Amino acid sequence: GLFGAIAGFIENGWQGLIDGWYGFRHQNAEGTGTAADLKSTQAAIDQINGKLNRLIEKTNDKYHQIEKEFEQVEGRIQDLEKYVEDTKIDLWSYNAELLVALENQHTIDVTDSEMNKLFERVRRQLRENAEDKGNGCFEIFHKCDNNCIESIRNGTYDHDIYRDEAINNRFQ
Amino acid sequence: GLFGAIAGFIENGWQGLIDGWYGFRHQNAEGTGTAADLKSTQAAIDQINGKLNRLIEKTNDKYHQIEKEFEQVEGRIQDLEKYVEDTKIDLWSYNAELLVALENQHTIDVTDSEMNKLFERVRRQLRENAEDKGNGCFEIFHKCDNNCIESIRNGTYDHDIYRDEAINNRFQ
Amino acid sequence: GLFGAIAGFIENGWQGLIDGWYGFRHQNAEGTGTAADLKSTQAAIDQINGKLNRLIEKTNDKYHQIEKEFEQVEGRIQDLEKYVEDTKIDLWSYNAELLVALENQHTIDVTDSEMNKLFERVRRQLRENAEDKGNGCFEIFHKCDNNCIESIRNGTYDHDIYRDEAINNRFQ
Amino acid sequence: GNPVICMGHHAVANGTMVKTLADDQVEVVTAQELVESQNLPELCPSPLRLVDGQTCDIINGALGSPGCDHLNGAEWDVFIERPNAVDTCYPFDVPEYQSLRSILANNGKFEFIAEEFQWNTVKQNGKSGACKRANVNDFFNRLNWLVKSDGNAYPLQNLTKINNGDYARLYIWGVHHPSTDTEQTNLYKNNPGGVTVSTKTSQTSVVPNIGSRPLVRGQSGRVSFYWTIVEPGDLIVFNTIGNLIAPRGHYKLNNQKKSTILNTAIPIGSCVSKCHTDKGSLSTTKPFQNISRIAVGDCPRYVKQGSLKLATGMRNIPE
Amino acid sequence: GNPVICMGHHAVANGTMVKTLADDQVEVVTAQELVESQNLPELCPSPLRLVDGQTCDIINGALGSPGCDHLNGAEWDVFIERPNAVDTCYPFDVPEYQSLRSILANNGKFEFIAEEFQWNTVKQNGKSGACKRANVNDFFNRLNWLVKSDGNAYPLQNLTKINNGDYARLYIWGVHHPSTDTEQTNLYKNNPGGVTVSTKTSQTSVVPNIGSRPLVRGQSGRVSFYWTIVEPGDLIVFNTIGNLIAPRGHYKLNNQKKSTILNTAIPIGSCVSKCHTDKGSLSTTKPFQNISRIAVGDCPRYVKQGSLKLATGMRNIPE
Amino acid sequence: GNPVICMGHHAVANGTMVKTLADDQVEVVTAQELVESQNLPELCPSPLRLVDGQTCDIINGALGSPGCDHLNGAEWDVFIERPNAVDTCYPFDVPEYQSLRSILANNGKFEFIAEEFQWNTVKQNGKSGACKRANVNDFFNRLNWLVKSDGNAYPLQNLTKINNGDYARLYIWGVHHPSTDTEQTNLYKNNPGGVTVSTKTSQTSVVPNIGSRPLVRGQSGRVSFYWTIVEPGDLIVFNTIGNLIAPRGHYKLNNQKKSTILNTAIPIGSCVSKCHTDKGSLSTTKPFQNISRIAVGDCPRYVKQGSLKLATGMRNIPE
Numbered sequence A, B, C: 001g002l003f004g005a006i007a008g009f010i011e012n013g014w015q016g017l018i019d020g021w022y023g024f025r026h027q028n029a030e031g032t033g034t035a036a037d038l039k040s041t042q043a044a045i046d047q048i049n050g051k052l053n054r055l056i057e058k059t060n061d062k063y064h065q066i067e068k069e070f071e072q073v074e075g076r077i078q079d080l081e082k083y084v085e086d087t088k089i090d091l092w093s094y095n096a097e098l099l100v101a102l103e104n105q106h107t108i109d110v111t112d113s114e115m116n117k118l119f120e121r122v123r124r125q126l127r128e129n130a131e132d133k134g135n136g137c138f139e140i141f142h143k144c145d146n147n148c149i150e151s152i153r154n155g156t157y158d159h160d161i162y163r164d165e166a167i168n169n170r171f172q
Numbered sequence D, E, F: 001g002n003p004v005i006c007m008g009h010h011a012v013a014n015g016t017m018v019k020t021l022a023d024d025q026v027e028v029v030t031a032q033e034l035v036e037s038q039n040l041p042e043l044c045p046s047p048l049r050l051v052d053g054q055t056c057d058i059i060n061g062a063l064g065s066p067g068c069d070h071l072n073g074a075e076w077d078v079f080i081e082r083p084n085a086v087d088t089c090y091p092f093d094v095p096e097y098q099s100l101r102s103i104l105a106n107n108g109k110f111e112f113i114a115e116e117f118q119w120n121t122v123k124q125n126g127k128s129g130a131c132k133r134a135n136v137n138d139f140f141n142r143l144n145w146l147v148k149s150d151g152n153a154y155p156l157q158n159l160t161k162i163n164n165g166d167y168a169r170l171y172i173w174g175v176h177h178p179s180t181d182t183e184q185t186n187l188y189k190n191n192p193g194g195v196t197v198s199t200k201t202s203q204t205s206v207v208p209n210i211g212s213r214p215l216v217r218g219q220s221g222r223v224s225f226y227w228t229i230v231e232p233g234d235l236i237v238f239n240t241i242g243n244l245i246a247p248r249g250h251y252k253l254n255n256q257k258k259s260t261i262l263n264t265a266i267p268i269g270s271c272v273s274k275c276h277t278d279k280g281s282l283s284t285t286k287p288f289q290n291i292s293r294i295a296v297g298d299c300p301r302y303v304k305q306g307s308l309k310l311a312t313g314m315r316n317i318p319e
């Protein structure tokens, strides 16, 4: 994808992440954990279901048309009838081929982007208290217990609480 | 959008910003101000007017065609005539539907991207003298008077002038 | 492009870079050098050749069709024959016009993105040992000889080796 | 400076391959097939009105051939015409066959309104051994075979019907082609025969053609069927000196003709669907189908590809 | 460490809804409608040449019916044919009506070049009460009704025109269908009549058809009109023993036929536009229109949707 | 704190302009042209089977005109028909010309199977001065001109061929149109003549038309050619009292008709290609071509644009 997160600096996905598309995995002094992120997951799901509904949309309600199968050749008018239907079929087949390729290209970019937005959200919450390790992970330069980790996940983490401790750990 | 700036980490737009699409809003010891950014605004406008001109482009210069309205049914040839026009109309209606959806999807991504490029431009000018607050705003860790703010907006800000003062404020 | 690297914060390309699409240019105490980056170059080439192969794909294997040139006018059936072919040609010409515009738009965004992924890769390797100068260049805050530069280019650079020296140079 | 928090995404063991602009096989976590490639082995009688012609195609149904009585009064969205249908009457052709069949099918109903034609001197209700009903010699029950009087007379016919109703009328009539000059004189006195049917703005004139045709149900003669449409405020005139296979009335035409015909051997069942192919009904929400270009109703669009997978998930990179 | 600078974008109070691939209602700051759904109540006489047929459709204009004199010499890009047009001459049909009308309209001009046909013995300039000009019995002024001499004679006609000009010629001729055998002999002696018109590579042979048609302007006879095209270096031969409605010359055909015809009741006004629908001219720069599939000139493409908004601005998130 | 590492991309001195959605001239490093706008000055005889009609168009080839012997047994994917082809026999027309030509071309072979028709009393093998072979009066060698016996007799013909083979048969027959009544009686005794050809389910009846046509190779008469298709299990009946231009057998029809015809003056050469336009073969991998809408085989799709450049590289910003 365009952002280089999925199949990029995020080495792989998590088969254990079964209640979300995106999420958090942490390690602290109390242990480890994996939790889904609802907002990013829902943003991706909405955009994809949105494509789906625009796709599985439209009529094609047709009754009296033209003949399309012929026992024996007749000449001029039958040639035209066959050429018209053949032209139609090729044009619609091309539309379908292109549509699915465009949608899929875009779907992959949307999901890659939502992964990147989640990462950037958390980076901005952490401010100077943490450093990007390069693999979609942050090293947190202060003690961060289960409540602290959860405050990061639900966006209530207050970086000024820990800034003095973290700055001192980072640079001395 | 793909970059997560507009309707993303930028919470909302500014109804007061009436002479540009993108801009700066600051607060310092002298007061507050809003100013448009010309370069980013113009880059977005150009790309959109570019779509517009490629769109409002093409001929369709047609004279002698086929009959398309019929008093009474005639059979074979009239069926074909109706089926041909009906096929044409459906294909062009599909083209128009897809075109506008693609263009709009792309237009929203372009404007979101230009917002993000502006933010990243300013981040790079500020170097170590400032920190991302997470809402499209930078906290500047040194006194920055109206001339200083303007030097940021027109890209003449020299970070080495203030680096000693800012580093000391950030980390001690 | 969407990421603002190519024709963005990267001021221009390098005509001297003849064995890759993307690469590194450095300056240290031993001298200067330009080297291609294989991974980013190959990722861009693959995506473009991929478009190419999907494009130069498909049949159009047609034999008995309809007449398309006429000495003199005949009326109803000839009108339909001309209108059918004219309709076909316009629809396929539109497909070709749109296809190339979409592909090119996307190709430019893909190459801009791969440039940005390369830059972000190197930023993440360097951690706190370097600062973004704003032009696609990093200032490295420690002595970095030819072996050190090469370790950055092939991803074996270990930032903890130099962190103490670099932190001290950056902030004191 | 030691706790770590990692941002990531889900994965499964085995995902689905899809195509993009750049790649013809990308694995994603989930995908949705957009081409319907399964059909039901039956046609659904709901919510569209299907009418099964069984042994009568729609031309024979309109003419009133033996075995076609069940189509009297019939109304349809789609006329289901069977490929194993059989001629059971006098051997005929239709000069503009497909056009008559189109008009009949499109109109969507068999509502016949009888009229009495005051034919002069000629004998009516001529029948034939090639058109047995119950056994016993008969004919198309919408047509009237006119032959000469017992006094060996067939005078010029000059008959007029005027349309003061609020609907356009469909009159179906025919012309008989005898095998020999003897057959001609034996039936219609005169030689040659001839028919002229006309409205205010159109007309049709037919000269019978005498000659030996291949034997079909013991007959070497042929009837050629024609039709005339009479708009409200118009009228129709029948002119003949022989060989006219007269109508017994007219079919009603809907102002709005919204129906059609589907030729298939597929049996009508009990399911519910608004999309019918010649292979059977489709029951699907997919936008496309590769089952048949012959499709009627509210259908997916027909395409050549057997599969087109839409990604409904991110790239799958497990571990 | 206390000053702040914020990066942002504009917004308005109320934006416009548009569709994307993913969302059918996204609010953006500005948008542009791409479907033209308004038309002018008039046709623009500029910069295309419109010619108003008024009471004459284009067939009647070509034949030279009463009231059609204003179309003599007429040149057009688009022939404006009115739905309330009226027949004002002898009751006729055209076997390939739409094809003749197409050829006439496409050609784009009524430039008639008279020729003298040296007809033998027969009387010329036959007129009729069904075709009054000024009152006083007349006929199509491009046609010549040939009837028998006062000596009750109608001999075989054998006349030839050769084309040594640099343009293809359009000859329009007709065949008369009498009501009765008496009408036939009263006009052309012989019975049956017959016409054969031929070029080097094509031909047309017509046998008149005698019979009672519905009364139209006091006539039960009909004329059937045909046409022949004579290329440079070709020639045309007229052969008849009766019933020929002869031409008085030929129409000139442009080598390049670029014109057409539009059927509508819309009045011609004074505006300027190069795009015409049957509902009126369009004055627009939009790429699409939902007003009518019947469109002539330099037009937006016709589509089914009533609205398609192109975003010309970013997403609108006010406050 | 002083070493620097810079990330960048390549550039060249002069790149290529391409279009995007937003910009109609963007310079990129490399690009690939998608429209083929060059053709070969020749047609490639490989790998498609081309058959050069040379001086015979395909109708004349089927009839067996003088000079057309080289097309006997010929098999083709594409029949190459030359614009400078010439009629070399009796002047004829074909009522449904384009349909017969389509059927012949589509079928893809000239495999003639002779049959003997036991014609009664009439003289066979009638020839003409308008159809010289070698000099010396001849005719279409697939047709048999029937004329009256030396005893001035032409009796009713009543002949039947039955199809018990495994292929559909194509019978080509004609009807002669004399110039005068004298010409008629001189050739076929009777007046009028007449032909009726019929199968079990179809028929065709023709009345000859006597009249002066333009002189073509010293003839003012015309032959009109018709055709009949006889399915396996069907049979054909010939009925005539004069003017029949009889067949000498039938053409074999492939069950699968996959061939076609291309009209062009372009010479056949020695190159290899599976795509042919009327301007010559294309040798290309490009998806589109602007050379001609008339294209046969495995071809790029035809489009109006002369150039469409696909970017195969990044934006070019040199220095």
Ligand SMILES: *[C@@H]1O[C@H](CO)[C@@H](O)[C@H](O)[C@H]1NC(C)=O
Residues within 6 Å of the ligand: D158, D159, D160, D237, E179, E180, E212, E220
């Ligand atoms: C019979 O024909 C005559 C003319 O031949 C006509 O005047 C009359 O209206 C016709 N009547 C009917 C009932 O068709």
Ligand SMILES: *[C@@H]1O[C@H](CO)[C@@H](O)[C@H](O)[C@H]1NC(C)=O
Residues within 6 Å of the ligand: D037, D290, D291, D292, D305, D306, D307
């Ligand atoms: C439709 O596609 C299926 C596979 O999805 C294939 O098996 C079937 O043959 C196709 N039907 C056609 C080509 O008529």
Ligand SMILES: *[C@@H]1O[C@H](CO)[C@@H](O)[C@H](O)[C@H]1NC(C)=O
Residues within 6 Å of the ligand: E158, E159, E160, E237, F179, F180, F212, F220
């Ligand atoms: C008249 O017809 C004869 C043959 O019947 C022909 O030779 C001659 O050219 C014709 N002349 C004209 C003037 O049509």
Ligand SMILES: *[C@@H]1O[C@H](CO)[C@@H](O)[C@H](O)[C@H]1NC(C)=O
Residues within 6 Å of the ligand: E037, E290, E291, E292, E305, E306, E307
């Ligand atoms: C065209 O669209 C307008 C709305 O933009 C609608 O009111 C009008 O009925 C439409 N015209 C049609 C469907 O012919």
Ligand SMILES: *[C@@H]1O[C@H](CO)[C@@H](O)[C@H](O)[C@H]1NC(C)=O
Residues within 6 Å of the ligand: D179, D180, D212, D220, F158, F159, F160, F237
């Ligand atoms: C000849 O015609 C008669 C009827 O006129 C028919 O019974 C017979 O089958 C025909 N025979 C041939 C050989 O055509």
Ligand SMILES: *[C@@H]1O[C@H](CO)[C@@H](O)[C@H](O)[C@H]1NC(C)=O
Residues within 6 Å of the ligand: F037, F290, F291, F292, F305, F306, F307
């Ligand atoms: C095809 O395009 C070329 C330019 O690429 C142009 O010179 C040529 O005239 C075009 N052929 C046409 C329009 O038939």
